[PDB]
Amino acid sequence: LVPEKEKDPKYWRDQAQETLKYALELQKLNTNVAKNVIMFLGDGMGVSTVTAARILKGQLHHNPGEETRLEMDKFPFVALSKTYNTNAQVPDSAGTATAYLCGVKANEGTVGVSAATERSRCNTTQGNEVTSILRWAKDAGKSVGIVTTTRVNHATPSAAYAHSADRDWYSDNEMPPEALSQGCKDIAYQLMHNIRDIDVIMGGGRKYMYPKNKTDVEYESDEKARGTRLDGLDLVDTWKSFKPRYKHSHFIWNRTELLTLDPHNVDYLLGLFEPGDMQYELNRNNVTDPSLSEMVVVAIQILRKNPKGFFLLVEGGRIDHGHHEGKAKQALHEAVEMDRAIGQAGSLTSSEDTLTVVTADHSHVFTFGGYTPRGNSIFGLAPMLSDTDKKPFTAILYGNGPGYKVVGGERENVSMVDYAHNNYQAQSAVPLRHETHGGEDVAVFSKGPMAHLLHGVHEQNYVPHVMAYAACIGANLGHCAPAA
Amino acid sequence: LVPEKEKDPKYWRDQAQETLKYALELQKLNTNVAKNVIMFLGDGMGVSTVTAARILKGQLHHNPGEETRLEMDKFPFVALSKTYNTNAQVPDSAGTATAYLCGVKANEGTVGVSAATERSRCNTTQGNEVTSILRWAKDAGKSVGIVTTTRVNHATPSAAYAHSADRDWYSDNEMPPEALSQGCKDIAYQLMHNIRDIDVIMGGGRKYMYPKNKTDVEYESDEKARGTRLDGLDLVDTWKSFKPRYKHSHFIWNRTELLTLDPHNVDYLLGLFEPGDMQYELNRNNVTDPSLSEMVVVAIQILRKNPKGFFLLVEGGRIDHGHHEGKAKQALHEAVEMDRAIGQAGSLTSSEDTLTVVTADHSHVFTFGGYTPRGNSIFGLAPMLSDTDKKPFTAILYGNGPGYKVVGGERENVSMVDYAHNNYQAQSAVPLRHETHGGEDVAVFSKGPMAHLLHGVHEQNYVPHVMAYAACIGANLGHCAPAA
Amino acid sequence: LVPEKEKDPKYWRDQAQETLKYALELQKLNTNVAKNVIMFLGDGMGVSTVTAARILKGQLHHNPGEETRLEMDKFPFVALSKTYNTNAQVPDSAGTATAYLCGVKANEGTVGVSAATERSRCNTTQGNEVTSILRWAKDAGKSVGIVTTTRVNHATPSAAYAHSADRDWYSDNEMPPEALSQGCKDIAYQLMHNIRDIDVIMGGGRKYMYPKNKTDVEYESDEKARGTRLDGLDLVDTWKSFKPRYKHSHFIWNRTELLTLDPHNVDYLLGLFEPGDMQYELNRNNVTDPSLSEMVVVAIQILRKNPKGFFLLVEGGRIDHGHHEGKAKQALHEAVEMDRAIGQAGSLTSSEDTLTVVTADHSHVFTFGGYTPRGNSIFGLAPMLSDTDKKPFTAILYGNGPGYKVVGGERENVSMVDYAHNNYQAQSAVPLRHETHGGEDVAVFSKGPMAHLLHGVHEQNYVPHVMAYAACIGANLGHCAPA
Amino acid sequence: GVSAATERSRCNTTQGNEVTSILRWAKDAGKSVGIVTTTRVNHATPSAAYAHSADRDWYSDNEMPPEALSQGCKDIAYQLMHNIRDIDVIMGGGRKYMYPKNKTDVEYESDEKARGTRLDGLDLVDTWK
Ligand SMILES: *[C@@H]1O[C@H](CO)[C@@H](O[C@@H]2O[C@H](CO)[C@@H](O)[C@H](O)[C@H]2NC(C)=O)[C@H](O)[C@H]1NC(C)=O
Ligand SMILES: *[C@@H]1O[C@H](CO)[C@@H](O[C@@H]2O[C@H](CO)[C@@H](O)[C@H](O)[C@H]2NC(C)=O)[C@H](O)[C@H]1NC(C)=O
Ligand SMILES: *[C@@H]1O[C@H](CO)[C@@H](O[C@@H]2O[C@H](CO)[C@@H](O)[C@H](O)[C@H]2NC(C)=O)[C@H](O)[C@H]1NC(C)=O
Ligand SMILES: *[C@@H]1O[C@H](CO)[C@@H](O[C@@H]2O[C@H](CO)[C@@H](O)[C@H](O)[C@H]2NC(C)=O)[C@H](O)[C@H]1NC(C)=O
Ligand SMILES: *[C@@H]1O[C@H](CO)[C@@H](O[C@@H]2O[C@H](CO)[C@@H](O)[C@H](O)[C@H]2NC(C)=O)[C@H](O)[C@H]1NC(C)=O
Ligand SMILES: *[C@@H]1O[C@H](CO)[C@@H](O[C@@H]2O[C@H](CO)[C@@H](O)[C@H](O)[C@H]2NC(C)=O)[C@H](O)[C@H]1NC(C)=O
Ligand SMILES: *[C@@H]1O[C@H](CO)[C@@H](O)[C@H](O)[C@H]1NC(C)=O
Ligand SMILES: *[C@@H]1O[C@H](CO)[C@@H](O)[C@H](O)[C@H]1NC(C)=O
Ligand SMILES: *[C@@H]1O[C@H](CO)[C@@H](O)[C@H](O)[C@H]1NC(C)=O
Ligand SMILES: *[C@@H]1O[C@H](CO)[C@@H](O)[C@H](O)[C@H]1NC(C)=O
Ligand SMILES: *[C@@H]1O[C@H](CO)[C@@H](O)[C@H](O)[C@H]1NC(C)=O
Ligand SMILES: *[C@@H]1O[C@H](CO)[C@@H](O)[C@H](O)[C@H]1NC(C)=O
Ligand SMILES: *[C@@H]1O[C@H](CO)[C@@H](O)[C@H](O)[C@H]1NC(C)=O
Ligand SMILES: [Ca+2]
Ligand SMILES: [Ca+2]
Ligand SMILES: [Ca+2]
Ligand SMILES: [Mg+2]
Ligand SMILES: [Mg+2]
Ligand SMILES: [Mg+2]
Ligand SMILES: [Mg+2]
Ligand SMILES: [Zn+2]
Ligand SMILES: [Zn+2]
Ligand SMILES: [Zn+2]
Ligand SMILES: [Zn+2]
Ligand SMILES: [Zn+2]
């Protein structure tokens, strides 16, 4: 396409020199204290997904896109995060979360607990618990919030509150007899009982909260949507019970109630907007379900009221799922939506006292190549046909996953399919049920007080140690001590 | 494997708080002036490549691998660089090196010219040349060196001294008639003539220097190692004839003469170690050819004589050819070999005066992931088998290229083959003759003075401006005016 | 030009539909309490002036410019403000200030008093004083700050603390002895003595604080910089004196001191960076003198301490000087600089508890136009030459001012002149020493709590009344009324 | 600090029956707060300003029966530093309940009976700063 302004060297020079001046002003560091702390987590947002979703974002504005700036791009400080679990080389959603929430690396498949546990053997839990930064914030006075698009007892959000030996123990319904009978209690149970004054909780998981076979508020006619608690416990009610009566506690289940609440009025909030995982944003109901930006806006309004500050984890957690499904147009629109939410937060707070980290737990085997010309749709085709099998190919290609498609001994001629569809699954090399995670590092975008402390190549479990220090919470208290 | 020390949460807590202590000390920025600037370019060294190579270095020491620190991993300041070309969303090795060496972004396939130059069109070069940091540093009075493992007129180093409308014009042999008509000389010519006192040149490409059909000094029988020049010019000899009279000038071609040189006592070196590209470090002749770290060290020793400092450019540029061949084992080893060069360079210069920026031009469609357990070999296999055709797969997989191996509509059973061999090509999604570049972002690593200025998610063309500012060369001399 | 995307109707429809989608969501009105209040005041930044300024900001980035968004362009709520003074159809710098700061229109020439007072007559200042929103806000226990690129006692910042029957009475040197004997105080004396705890005061006007003939600290070889107080008073030392017992006061005078500051250690700041008016942004000493954005940042960094909130007045006051001189490139660069400063104010505060308001006191007779093509430089020429005298002309043109040039009965052919130059005076219709104000309306831009209350075409006095209601300060404070 | 649902020395009946004191209400509204007594500062009377316990006897953990500690409740001295962490003025007695078991006293260095008591090993004076 070649924009006309970009053929002028003065353009590229002027631009780089402006960039330089800013980097010269960034030498005055922010050594304030983090009153508030916010962490964004694109589940599965590796470095390649960041780029592809920057392109996507701008392309939704009829710009070439590669020139575009994400909201996460504007963060002054970036670093790289080594993401392997003690258990495995190519890590998982949960043990990574124990790293970047609890400050301790752990075995795959285990939340809230250290490496001294094995997965699914349950007596190995006690004495091997590590508490998260969300627990550190609450014990410090702050308000704590969790916002996600996955089940609020899924792998990423659990390690903010739970301590399980298996990520799969959503309720007692999916536990084995042994773990139950050995005393262990489900993630959905631990959401309500480990920290009982979690100010904001928003996401999915309505069906893990209600007594078995109880109908759903949204879908009566759906059986798989029905309750699963073998406890017979109404955990929505167990929740309302654990909050004082002279404080306003609201439980909502749809968008309309969400955009109806008065934030200066409510004290505790539980929004459970689907039985399990929430909608893809391409798939959402503008009526019944809210967006992630909507959840995050209201969440910060409630949590802003605490004068001690607050801590808010936000999981753009459905990015992982679009990739696992091999449906990249889903993964990428999911990531753009978590960027819209990042934008919102920066508008509702101030760089001067709020430390914001955007990062990923791990990455996927999502690539895009093919020498595509400037501005070529990210879901478009590489510019000419294969050197080998003489058929065209997509710019996006996966390393493994369900896109593998050899229609009769040869690979699909994607010219008369719709690669531009929402549920198109780009080809991969190894067919599988699901696409796997990637071992490559992920970036760490930091803004606000003490953000520069996230530098270089670090281990993933360094991430919450930085934040805890900046907000004078947790184990190290030096950034507030007069001894510093 | 799950190492024992790593089961104690004290272990990780102690490590992060170690890392936290280091991070606080970096609050004392290094505001010195860059006496010397050394830039390590790894042709095609994507984020995923760096991580995979970090593991391999550690696995060559029989450590688990994932917990290793490459030499480049020890740089304090990491950033993400946006790689796209004005022309091409997925860029090439030429127009990116215009950007990270001249600070201007260009069209794919051109070097040292603005985007107002159209590829292969010679009459569009005049008036659109843009000079390089290597030029800016000669003009400030420094020693300038180029040390690559590709040809010394390959697209990457050629952007440092040349201004050419097609990466492909190696000699005048490879130039169309009307391009010679119109007047613009080949690259090999420009290497000798544009900047006629380059202090160190070293790498491949010897055949491009000698006139057509002239037996190579090393490969006397080989017919493709003969010179290519219709010029008739002996450019090794022209290189000698430009240099000042009472200064000692040397031209080497085998590894032995390199180490016999006494650096304290040579002023102008030219080492041409192969008729074309130097061979992969795995096929390196201990006898006839030096390694990157051997070329680098001898180079630095000749350059630190100049009291005004030196700019060195080092390209570990067979990383790109590695991935392009699908031979992940080649490219990873190149990457590690370039890391060894980074350590050598570090122990021959001081941080207090030497800004060392390490980055890449672009990435590749190289991924790894298979849920491989901790310590797994990087070239090894994924633990359990494909859900869709029950065959095994390698943890390393490509998005395209020559690893696509269907053996009858079924995809090759790799339990049958040596998936750990050097020239083994991991499988790909789309069969192409050559694996393609990836359009995602690449890391920048920086240590030494002003290194904290390479900080965010920035355009690729930003890099040489930081370097030129740090060093008080080129356009913005502001780091050296009276302004402390 | 004609960018490639703008040829496609989907582009313009997608664009509108997202502009509309945002417009809907803005229906959930922000009714919070303005903890902090920030007012940005572009002196002379009329409506024509901010269209040209938005071109300029984007043209700096090598864009065509017209599609660029300023920072204030991003505020949700726009209004038109009727600027007329009470004895002047085309208003002045000071009497408007009485309106948009004190909520009361007044006569041209007078700060901080009502329309009862006649100019240069002190014996009508007696008992005709109106207080400003700075006073009202301080009176409710907020920190308050003034940050300007004119003198800190110029016409516009003097409406926040002074009640002076003549905007010329900068110090007592400039006052007729007839008024000194009626017993009035110069604005500079009034700064330090009326509201004695203003937390930040930043700008020009240093020479009015030191005693007469006193050699100046920055430009000492020069006597138009020397002290002017006949009082013999040292109001920098007088300023340090009225501060509470255990509080840190500074007084800084150069840019190095401004960024050395630790805003966790400075309760009262005073910063006087030039003897008189500060240097145009395009002329400024990178080293001795701070930009407007630099001053706004550490001003907010200090005032963020106070837990009750703060009020801050920011005046980009040198746009008026730029137009008055006919030098559009200075006036437009001053406007862009204040925009930068408006962007900074957005990242250091949050729109949930901060109402910020961007406006101008009045406009100028600055126009621009001549069927220029798209992307044409704002300081460039119309495409065709005058069909009458066959000579080029500049897109930017003035109603009056020093721009008028006739070289021997002949209007100046301008291809022969550097009309892009930082001091070029684009041609006018009536020559004058200084170009004049405009009597047209000026926009208001408001973001944050109760910002939607600045809504239509209102009188100019109505502005601080909305700011005061929303921050629960001053005379009407039913927005906090436990109901 | 507990309602009438709690039962004395039955720890697991604390959660959900805490009631907060006027001292807490006052700090929550921004007032400075102080507690000056001549008894120990974790004695019955002042403790109701900050603590919520099921037995007044639980001055430090050294006095707590283990199943109380097992069920997680913290001793009153602990709660004095942790519950409201900005009590402006705390004056009175109870120095021994603030330091780890057997640290001699700053004032009576040769008293058996005056050594620290904390099995937490904690220095609650530093905890407090
Ligand atoms: C969102 O949830 C609210 C529940 O508060 C729904 O409103 C209720 O709808 C039922 C069905 O007619 C009424 O009997 C209730 O009186 C309503 N309550 C309130 C507070 O309005 C609402 O319909 C839901 N919206 C959607 C789209 O499902
Ligand atoms: C891949 O598919 C395309 C289209 O399905 C094939 O190309 C078309 O062949 C028909 C045959 O008459 C033409 O009418 C079309 O114009 C062709 N082009 C397109 C874009 O439709 C193509 O040959 C197929 N190639 C392989 C290797 O399968
Ligand atoms: C490395 O290069 C040197 C120089 O080209 C080689 O040495 C030459 O050997 C012949 C044999 O008679 C002599 O006549 C030349 O004069 C020698 N030159 C010099 C400079 O000594 C040497 O053989 C080469 N070694 C390898 C391993 O290739
Ligand atoms: C993939 O190849 C492997 C090895 O070539 C097959 O596995 C072996 O097959 C032989 C057949 O005689 C058995 O005796 C071995 O016990 C098998 N296992 C191993 C570990 O060697 C395997 O069946 C092939 N799978 C497919 C789907 O083709
Ligand atoms: C900015 O102001 C500071 C302080 O007003 C100046 O520092 C003075 O430096 C001289 C030496 O050059 C000392 O003798 C003085 O004692 C310092 N002043 C004070 C008040 O301590 C500084 O030189 C000024 N810088 C510029 C660029 O104008
Ligand atoms: C306005 O000035 C321009 C020059 O700045 C005049 O144009 C030149 O006129 C001479 C002869 O009169 C020609 O030789 C040149 O080629 C013209 N062009 C330039 C760029 O110099 C123009 O005629 C003047 N017009 C009026 C009405 O005064
Ligand atoms: C847990 O129970 C199992 C019974 O299968 C036993 O073998 C194991 O030793 C127990 N673990 C511990 C830590 O006691
Ligand atoms: C949401 O509203 C838009 C209005 O433009 C409509 O086109 C869209 O179909 C609605 N949502 C979905 C999921 O379709
Ligand atoms: C560049 O060369 C071509 C080759 O003949 C010529 O046709 C063309 O006109 C030249 N470019 C311009 C701008 O004239
Ligand atoms: C290089 O030399 C080492 C020992 O010096 C030898 O063991 C190795 O096999 C050689 N490698 C090649 C590729 O020639
Ligand atoms: C007060 O103002 C009047 C205006 O009519 C003037 O004549 C008179 O002299 C003033 N007062 C004094 C004491 O001069
Ligand atoms: C201000 O600094 C810049 C450095 O980039 C320089 O180019 C410019 O000329 C300087 N101008 C003044 C007036 O100091
Ligand atoms: C207290 O403990 C007893 C057994 O020690 C238990 O049965 C009872 O349920 C507990 N109380 C509560 C309120 O859970
Ligand atoms: Ca719903
Ligand atoms: Ca050789
Ligand atoms: Ca000055
Ligand atoms: Mg997840
Ligand atoms: Mg190369
Ligand atoms: Mg003014
Ligand atoms: Mg008592
Ligand atoms: Zn995940
Ligand atoms: Zn996952
Ligand atoms: Zn390359
Ligand atoms: Zn004015
Ligand atoms: Zn004016």
Residue numbers in the entry:
A (entry chain H), B (entry chain G): 18 to 501
C (entry chain F): 18 to 500
D (entry chain D): 129 to 257
Sentences from the paper on this structure:
HPP patients exhibit hypo-mineralization and osteopenia due to the deficiency or malfunction of tissue non-specific alkaline phosphatase (TNAP), which catalyzes the hydrolysis of phosphate-containing molecules outside the cells, promoting the deposition of hydroxyapatite in the extracellular matrix.
Crystallization trials showed the crystals of purified hTNAP could grow in both acidic and basic pH conditions diffracting to about 5–10 Å resolution. In both structures determined with hTNAP crystals grown in acidic and basic pH conditions, four TNAP dimers, i.e., protomers A-B, C-D, E-F, and G-H, form an X-shape homo-octamer stabilized with the molecular contacts among protomers B, F, D, and H. The TNAP octamer is maintained with four major interfaces between dimeric TNAPs. The tetramers A/B/C/D and E/F/G/H then dimerize to form the octamer with two small interfaces (interface S) comprising H7, H14, and some loops. However, the disruption of the hTNAP function resulting from mutations on the octameric interface implies that hTNAP may be stabilized by octamerization, which prevents the interfaces from exposure. The conserved catalytic residue S110 was solved as the unphosphorylated form in all the protomers, which serve as a nucleophile in attacking the phosphorous.
